[PDB]
Structures are given as C-alpha cells and as structure tokens.
Scaffold this motif. Structure first.
Motif, PDB file in Angstrom:
ATOM      1  N   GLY A 123      25.666  51.411  59.039  1.00 35.84           N
ATOM      2  CA  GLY A 123      26.189  52.367  58.084  1.00 35.84           C
ATOM      3  C   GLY A 123      27.661  52.094  57.885  1.00 35.84           C
ATOM      4  N   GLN A 124      28.085  50.913  58.313  1.00 33.39           N
ATOM      5  CA  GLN A 124      29.472  50.529  58.180  1.00 33.39           C
ATOM      6  C   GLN A 124      29.767  49.871  56.838  1.00 33.39           C
ATOM      7  OE1 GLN A 124      31.342  48.563  61.488  1.00 33.39           O
ATOM      8  NE2 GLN A 124      30.372  49.938  62.978  1.00 33.39           N
ATOM      9  N   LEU A 125      28.738  49.714  56.013  1.00 34.41           N
ATOM     10  CA  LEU A 125      28.933  49.148  54.686  1.00 34.41           C
ATOM     11  C   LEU A 125      28.757  50.345  53.762  1.00 34.41           C
ATOM     12  CD1 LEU A 125      26.824  45.888  54.820  1.00 34.41           C
ATOM     13  CD2 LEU A 125      29.209  46.211  55.457  1.00 34.41           C
ATOM     14  N   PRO A 126      29.880  50.951  53.339  1.00 32.31           N
ATOM     15  CA  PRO A 126      29.897  52.119  52.457  1.00 32.31           C
ATOM     16  C   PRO A 126      29.086  51.961  51.189  1.00 32.31           C
ATOM     17  CG  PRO A 126      31.945  50.948  52.296  1.00 32.31           C
ATOM     18  CD  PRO A 126      31.242  50.418  53.518  1.00 32.31           C
ATOM     19  N   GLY A 127      28.251  52.953  50.905  1.00 33.48           N
ATOM     20  CA  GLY A 127      27.437  52.908  49.706  1.00 33.48           C
ATOM     21  C   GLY A 127      26.216  52.018  49.821  1.00 33.48           C
ATOM     22  N   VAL A 128      26.288  51.005  50.684  1.00 32.41           N
ATOM     23  CA  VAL A 128      25.168  50.088  50.882  1.00 32.41           C
ATOM     24  C   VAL A 128      24.050  50.865  51.564  1.00 32.41           C
ATOM     25  CG1 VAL A 128      24.457  47.849  51.749  1.00 32.41           C
ATOM     26  CG2 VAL A 128      26.849  48.252  51.168  1.00 32.41           C
ATOM     27  N   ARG A 129      22.814  50.471  51.302  1.00 26.77           N
ATOM     28  CA  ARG A 129      21.684  51.200  51.838  1.00 26.77           C
ATOM     29  C   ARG A 129      20.398  50.381  51.740  1.00 26.77           C
ATOM     30  NH1 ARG A 129      20.570  57.390  49.762  1.00 26.77           N
ATOM     31  NH2 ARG A 129      18.382  57.591  50.439  1.00 26.77           N
ATOM     32  N   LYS A 130      19.285  50.989  52.133  1.00 21.53           N
ATOM     33  CA  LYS A 130      17.994  50.324  52.097  1.00 21.53           C
ATOM     34  C   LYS A 130      17.339  50.536  50.737  1.00 21.53           C
ATOM     35  CE  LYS A 130      15.245  50.116  55.532  1.00 21.53           C
ATOM     36  NZ  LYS A 130      14.265  49.099  55.944  1.00 21.53           N
ATOM     37  N   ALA A 131      17.104  49.433  50.029  1.00 23.15           N
ATOM     38  CA  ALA A 131      16.495  49.472  48.707  1.00 23.15           C
ATOM     39  C   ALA A 131      14.985  49.635  48.791  1.00 23.15           C
ATOM     40  CB  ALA A 131      16.841  48.201  47.954  1.00 23.15           C
ATOM     41  N   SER A 132      14.446  50.616  48.085  1.00 22.65           N
ATOM     42  CA  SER A 132      13.006  50.850  48.091  1.00 22.65           C
ATOM     43  C   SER A 132      12.548  51.187  46.678  1.00 22.65           C
ATOM     44  CB  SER A 132      12.662  52.008  49.031  1.00 22.65           C
ATOM     45  OG  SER A 132      11.311  52.413  48.870  1.00 22.65           O
TER      46      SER A 132
END
Ligand code: MG
Ligand code: MG
Ligand code: MG
Ligand code: MG
Ligand code: MG
Ligand code: MG
Ligand code: MG
Ligand code: MG
Ligand code: MG
Ligand code: MG
Ligand code: MG
Ligand code: MG
Ligand code: MG
Ligand code: ZN
Lengths: 64, 98, 206, 60, 84, 24
Positions: free
Chosen positions: D50-59
């Motif tokens: 969660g250290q990459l702001p805004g980045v997340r798991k794409a589904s």
RNA sequence: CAGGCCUUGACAUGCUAGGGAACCCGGGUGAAAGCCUGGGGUGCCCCGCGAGGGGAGCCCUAGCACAGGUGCUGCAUGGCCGUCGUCAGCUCGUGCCGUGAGGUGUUGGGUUAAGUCCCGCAACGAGCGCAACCCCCGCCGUUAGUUGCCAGCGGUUCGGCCGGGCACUCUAACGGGACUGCCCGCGAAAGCGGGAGGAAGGAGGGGACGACGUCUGGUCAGCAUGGCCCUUACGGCCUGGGCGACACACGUGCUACAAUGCCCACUACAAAGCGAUGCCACCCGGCAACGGGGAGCUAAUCGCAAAAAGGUGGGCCCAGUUCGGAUUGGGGUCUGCAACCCGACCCCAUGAAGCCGGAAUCGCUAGUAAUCGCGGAUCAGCCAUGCCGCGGUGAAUACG
C-alpha cells in the motif's frame, strides 16, 4: 444510433422500438413480450484472460 | 468565470473536496456550474507474479485518476474569499483557471 | 506458492494506504523514491520504539510523515530533543521542509507489525521458536482480538532442515474480504541464516 | 546486481544511447516501469504494502 | 540496399591518421578498431588491419571496395562445418 | 495477403504507410 | 571472449603518514580507458615583527581496517512463485469407543456447483476451506451537465456550427433491483420440475480470491541471507567481438496453399488506451519511407485514428494465377557517436516452397470457437508474428 457494429445497432434499435411501442400503448406488452423484444440481451464480449490466448482459447502444448 | 478542475486517486476524497468548493462559493457568488464528473484515465500494470520464469503468473494492478469540473462563473471577492482560506483534502490536486 | 498479501488484498476496502497524495505523472517516481528514502531512516533510527507504520501525506514541497510507535518517548527524546534531531537530519534527505509526528500505539499486542518484531526478536536472541509463537498468539489473543496467527519459517532452532512452525487462535478468515486483518512480517538474521516471521491479527469485521 | 554496475547513476555517459534504467529499489534492469522507477518485482511488493499511492488491484 | 543518408561516416582515428600517411608514404599495416568506418578513396592502396574481436587482420583496401564499411573484410565467426 | 508488404493489407499489417497504403 | 588498462580500487565508514592539500583550463600518447605533463591556484580558525610553526573541509601517495565478486551451495535459507486445483476437502476441542496404534464427529439417506443444505446418528461444537463481504458487465432511479442534442424553437457560411436546453446518449458517484419472494406439482425436509411478473431467475455472465498439505518443485542472476571460495585479481575501466554462430532435431507461433478468394476504387458501423522535447492537424516537396513549415492539446473540448472484416461498383477466371511472398540484386528514408558482423521502414527488380499436410497430436460448450481490425507496457530505434488488453461479425455440437 452510436457505438458497436451495425449488427448490434440493429438489435438495439429493435429494443428502442419495442420500448416506445409500450409508451404509446402499455397494453402492447401483453403481446409484445411473449416474443421477448422487451428483453435486453446481456451477451457480451468476454474479457481476455492472461495465460490463455483469448479468454478461453488456450495455448497448445506439444508432447505433454 | 473561473473553471476549477479537481483530480485525485481517491474518488471520495474528490467527491468530498469538490462538494466543499461548491457549497462554499454557492453563497458568496453564483451557484456554480455544478460539479461535473469527467471520464477517468486508467493505468494498468501487468506484472508476472513471481520472480524468475512462470510467464503465466501475472496479477493486475491499476492507478485510476479521477476528475471533476465545478466551474464557477461570476467571482465576487468573497467568492474567492471562501476559497483561498478554507482547504483540506490531501489526495486532491486542484487547478483553478478562468 | 499462494496466498495474496492480506493487506494489498483489501486496500479498496478495510485498509488505507501508507502514502496518500494526489496525482503526478512526472513526479510520482520522485515522491515515491522520497517516501521510500524517508521510511529508510525511520525504519532504522527509530526501531527501538516500535515502528509500526509510517504514514505519509503531501501537498507541494510539504511532507507530513506520521510515525506510529508503541514507545514514543524513545522517538521524542529527553524533554523533546531527538524528534528535533530527526526533523533536521531528515530534511537533509530532502529539502521540502517536512513536518513529523509521533502518534502512539494503544496496545502493541494488537499490532501485527509489532508482534512479528517481538517474535523475530526472541528468535534472534535464541528462544524456543514454538514457545515464542504460542505466547505471542496468546498475547494478541489475550488482549482482545477475534483471532490471531503466527508463522516462523527458516531453519527453526538452527536445524539443518528448514521447517515452518504454525500456531493460531480464534478466526483468521483470509478469504473474507472485509474481515480487517492486520498483517505483519519480520525478518530475523541469525548465526545460521534468516527466518521469516508472519503475524496475522483479526480485529472486528464489518 | 553488481554495485559496480550501478554506474548508470553516472549521468555522465559518453553518449546518451548508452544510458539505461535500473530499478530504484532492487537495482534490477530487466523490466523496470518508467512511471515508478521500480522493477516488476519491486512494484508488486510495494504495491501490496500500500506504499504505492492510488495503485491497487485491478479487477474486471 | 544499404543506408546512411548524408554523412558517410568514418572514425577520424584512422581518417586523420590515413590522410597523414598520404602526405608521405604507405605505412605497412595500420591496426584499427574502427570496424565501423566507411572505406574511402584515400584509404585505397593502404593496408588497414581490422580486429575480429580477437586478432588484427591485414586488409589491402582496393578502389573497387570503397564504400564498404571497414571490417566486413574481417570475419568474426570461425566456422568450418559440422561435418565429421 | 498480410504477408505482402506492397499491398493495402501488407501495409496495414506491418502497420506502415506508403505508395501501396497512402495516409489518405 | 580477445586485447589495452586500474588498483583502497567504480561505491561505505575509519586510522598512520612523506606531503601538496580547495579550485580551473590546456597539451602529450592512445581505439578508448588509462598514462605522462604544463599549469591559472588556496582562502580557513589560530601563534606571531616576521622567516616561519600547527590544526579543519578538501586533496594525492605510501601502509592498514576494508570495499567489490551475476564465484559455488535453492540438498543450509527468507521472500515470492509454480503444482494438484477453485478440486471439496483438511483438521481441532470436549465427550464417547478401543489394552493400543487409533475410531467416532467428517459415516448413513435426500440434495448441491460445494464437508451446499436437509434428515438421521455418541456425539456437541469450532477452525482453515465452500459460499457471502469487493470489482466489471445486464435494467432502473437520484445528483452533476462545455459529452449530448430541432428531442423543441429561432438563426445557419447548414459542420450541433451559433443562441439556447437539460430531455435523451453519455460521463461518474450514490442508490434501487432477485429472495425460490410469487402460483402449480413431487417432497419428510432440504430441494427438484414447470409457470408468472421482471432487463435479469434460481450461483444472470466475467473477474479478484486458492484450505491443511504435496514435490528434497523453481529462483542464492531481482532482492535478502548461513557457509565455502577470489581478493593485482573469480574485483574495476575500455575498445572490439560473442549472446544473432550451423549438417542437423524439437517446442510455440506467423503467412499461405486461394473464387465463401485476391485486387483497386467509393462508402459505413467500435472499444479500450496513449501523448514534452510528446502526440502531431493542415500546407508544401517527394512514387514513398520521410523531409521543411506549422495550428491545436498539458488532452471527454487537440492529436495518434485509418478501425478491419462489412456495404456498392469494377477487374482477375481456376492458372501455381492479379494465389503466395521466401530469396536475391539495386536505390533510399529514420533512429542513433555508430546500424559490417547485427535495426526498422520505403520504392524498383527478383518472385522460392506451398494445391491443405504420414504416424501421432492441440484448443474451444456462446457472445465461446472461428475470423477482423484497434491500443499499451518495455522502448532512441527494433528484429513484436511475443505478451497484456479492446471492440466488430459470430457458429457447430454434446446420445451418452
Ligand atoms: Mg474477440
Ligand atoms: Mg537502450
Ligand atoms: Mg498478392
Ligand atoms: Mg526448493
Ligand atoms: Mg524457497
Ligand atoms: Mg536448478
Ligand atoms: Mg480391538
Ligand atoms: Mg480408554
Ligand atoms: Mg461448511
Ligand atoms: Mg469465495
Ligand atoms: Mg532440488
Ligand atoms: Mg538468445
Ligand atoms: Mg467449461
Ligand atoms: Zn526492483
């Protein structure tokens, strides 16, 4: 009509027509629906999954 | 006739901010052009799950950047007074240009 | 080889990021490096205090940084001189003129990141792994929690054949995407090799 | 990754065609992402934390 | 169907080095690593030695091979067949 | 077909433009 | 790999010291790296009339602690991953049975996609897993309108262009909606079949998610890490070559062997993306790649873009062909210091094998396969037909 292909548009147009028809006369449903024109075909292009070649088309293996 | 363009990774962080920028300037001046959504640009990152080989692992990541408009026409000092003074959101980057 | 990071798995839901700052397609790879550089020190010149999470916010050459700890006194310093040393020695990494903070951890027994550290700690000394685990699982369970689980890997006990000690209580529903499970990992350098240490803490649910 | 090989950091290359990339974090080179400066491995790790702001798991 | 455009490249290592030889005579062999150099009239007659990446080979440059890049007359691979 | 670089499709395939496939 | 070259070393911390130490510009040799050299050139705190004496940053050399090693061990390891397999399972606590290993529970009857649920039972429960909580797609509502639109009116250089309008499409945030709820039948129950209403029906379609464990599984060349090993070299720089070699064998693919086709012209429907030394409108030069100029956009308001298959017309006439483009000769553009080894693209010429493939063998159950085109990451450029993803057209078949 905007979006997709003309074959898809033909179908949408077919929905819109079936729908307006009902506003003009709600009583149409009772006879316009047994054909299902008022149903929104939900069939859609399947996501291309990784690992496979096309959502489903699976790469082939030789002498496994 | 100032046009505000709010962007952010979090959609509620904007919904929050943008809402303020409206309710605020909704007094000191015009009622704003209403906050408008605007399409979202999306970044994809497809990375092999494990190090070394396993070309079929993958796992999908994405960085979605949201946008808004608001758009305030008819600025009256206080209209700008409710702005420059009150600020909050951290994940919200603002662009005010008339 | 399986199991998603329990945190990464629920960022959208029950779990905020450790870095929350607006857009930036030309500086992202710079603020990030910075956020990293930051954590670098903080996860060093701040270990003995219970470094359990380093949040970070931004807004144009303005960094927040909120170091959560179980023993803030160790962070602040005598009367409050170290937190002053940090801030300065810190702005030596980046100009920016960055703030700082020291919010305490109300009960580190419910902080997975910390629990990992405790167990990794004892192991580093030379305690009975199996024990360490049972106890920690207890503490975490002992101080509330609806479930807990610890996993030490490596050459348990200096053994030549690597193994993996278990231990868990209550519920730790890794699949239920909403449980809110704190995750924590801790290394463990040893006279004979590394040992990974994983901690799972189940808190409430909704 | 050889410490020695991280000479790339030398913004002083005879010609710019020789200037490559390398991961900010692991020092890799084989598959670094410009937008992050991180390699495919380092990106998934940080991503997950969660250290990459805004980045997340794409589904989808 | 080769390509270059406008500037038919030549490493001045041997270029400035070859025109100096013209001013006088012909120096037997001229070891170079400028395998990338384009052969030009001046070079003609001379004898530039190019590297395989292992050895320097004597290459009598002729007027009918002008234009061909140096080397290219200095093969790299050592292949004599798989036969046996 | 897609194989022939000097035809409409050849170009489209190689994603190029030229005599056989003008940029309009 | 060959050659040239450096050694406290390209990078961290620290000590002794001949001794100048900050700094700045050139020359010599050389492929480069490196090596030799000339030379603008020291303020600093401090003692002092001063010759001069001494320390600090910086700085070179000698010597030391030491750096550095993608050098070995995945049978010393962490971490991450693959795998059975998204399969319907794996266990625990207490009780009960057994001298004991253990057993019961988790078996049995019905049922489910499922250890799913029902009924029964010396077992009563629990945990991991199944399901659900999350994302995308189907319908609708509210909120928002520089996308949309004569839906509605007016003007039109008739392009939604303009005024204007939020209705519709859309954009994106929230919310409603399906629960075997409703009717019929079977049933002990769960549930099964059928019917209605509904955009949707019994898990509506696709994702994310992968149990305890299995394999001495994979990776010390991502990183990390125990041990062993090299420390003028198993470290470091450079130039060049090699990873692109070929008599051959195999895997995965691309293009094709043609008329349900190939070609030229005109003409029409899409989605998801990308854009700073970036995408490039438009104009001009050129057969062209591309070049020169140059508007717009920081990008729902500009650009990449032409979607292709399709439709209308015309050509070819069954030919190894107007099928198919390998191979080679020639000319040239662009990138890049540089495209011989070893780039891509354009144009002329050349125009190969190939007539649907032996034994054997692979994918796919629907918006799937098949077929068609479009985008992206990496990236100067590119060997991408690879990979990840998008939409168009759109089947056959399943007794068992
Ligand atoms: Mg498709
Ligand atoms: Mg490069
Ligand atoms: Mg042809
Ligand atoms: Mg192994
Ligand atoms: Mg392992
Ligand atoms: Mg191996
Ligand atoms: Mg017995
Ligand atoms: Mg007994
Ligand atoms: Mg169950
Ligand atoms: Mg599930
Ligand atoms: Mg093995
Ligand atoms: Mg290779
Ligand atoms: Mg199936
Ligand atoms: Zn990395």
């Amino acid at each position: 009509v905007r979006g997709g292909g003309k074959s898809g548009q033909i179908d949408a147009i077919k929905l819109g027509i079936a729908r307006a028809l009902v506003q003009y006369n709600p009583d149409y449903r009772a006879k316009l629906k047994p054909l299902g024109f008022l149903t929104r075909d939900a069939r859609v292009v399947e996501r291309k999954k990784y690992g496979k070649h096309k959502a489903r088309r699976a790469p082939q293996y030789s002498k496994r | 006739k100032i046009r505000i363009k709010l962007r952010g990774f979090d959609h509620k962080t904007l919904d929050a901010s943008a809402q303020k920028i409206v309710e605020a300037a909704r007094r000191s001046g015009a009622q704003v052009s209403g906050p408008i959504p605007l399409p979202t640009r999306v970044r994809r990152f497809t990375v092999i799950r494990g190090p070394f080989k396993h070309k079929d692992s993958r796992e999908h990541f994405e960085l979605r950047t949201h946008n808004r408009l608001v758009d305030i026409i008819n600025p009256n000092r206080k209209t700008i007074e409710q702005l420059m003074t009150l600020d909050l959101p951290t994940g919200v980057e603002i662009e005010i240009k008339t | 080889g399986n199991k998603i990071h329990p945190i990464g798995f629920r960022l959208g839901i029950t779990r905020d990021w450790e870095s929350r700052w607006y857009a930036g397609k030309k500086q992202y790879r710079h603020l990030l490096l910075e956020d990293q550089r930051i954590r670098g020190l903080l996860e060093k010149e701040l270990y003995s205090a219970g470094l359990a999470r380093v949040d970070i916010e931004r807004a144009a050459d303005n960094v927040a940084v909120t170091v959560h700890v179980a023993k803030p006194g160790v962070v602040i310093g005598r009367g409050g001189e170290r937190i002053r040393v940090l801030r300065e020695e810190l702005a030596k990494l980046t100009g920016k003129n960055v703030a700082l903070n020291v919010q305490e951890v109300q009960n580190p027994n419910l902080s997975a990141p910390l629990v990992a550290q405790r167990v990794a700690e004892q192991i580093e000394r030379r305690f009975a792994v199996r024990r360490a685990i049972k106890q920690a699982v207890q503490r975490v369970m002992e101080s509330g929690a609806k479930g807990a689980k610890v996993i030490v890997s490596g050459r348990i006990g200096g053994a030549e054949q690597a193994r993996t000690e278990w231990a868990a209580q209550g519920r730790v529903p890794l699949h239920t995407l909403r449980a809110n499970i704190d995750y924590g990992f801790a290394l463990a350098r040893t006279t004979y090799g590394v040992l990974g240490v994983k901690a799972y803490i189940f808190l409430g649910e909704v | 990754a050889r410490k020695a090989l991280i000479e790339k950091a030398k913004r002083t290359p005879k010609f710019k065609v020789r200037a490559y990339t390398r991961c900010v974090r692991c020092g890799r080179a084989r598959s670094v992402y410009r937008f992050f400066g991180l390699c495919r491995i380092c990106l998934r790790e940080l991503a997950h934390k969660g250290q990459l702001p805004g980045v997340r798991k794409a589904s989808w | 169907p080769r390509s270059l455009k406008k500037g038919v490249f030549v490493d001045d290592h041997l270029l400035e080095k070859v025109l100096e030889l013209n001013a006088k005579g012909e120096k037997r062999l001229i070891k170079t690593w400028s395998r990338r150099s384009t052969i030009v009239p001046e070079m003609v007659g001379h004898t530039i030695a190019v590297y395989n990446g292992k050895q320097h080979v004597p290459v009598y440059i002729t007027e009918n091979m002008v234009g061909h890049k140096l080397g290219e007359f200095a093969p790299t691979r050592t292949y004599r067949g798989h036969g046996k | 077909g897609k194989g022939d670089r000097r035809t409409r499709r050849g170009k489209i395939w190689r994603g190029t433009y030229g005599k056989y496939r003008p940029r309009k």
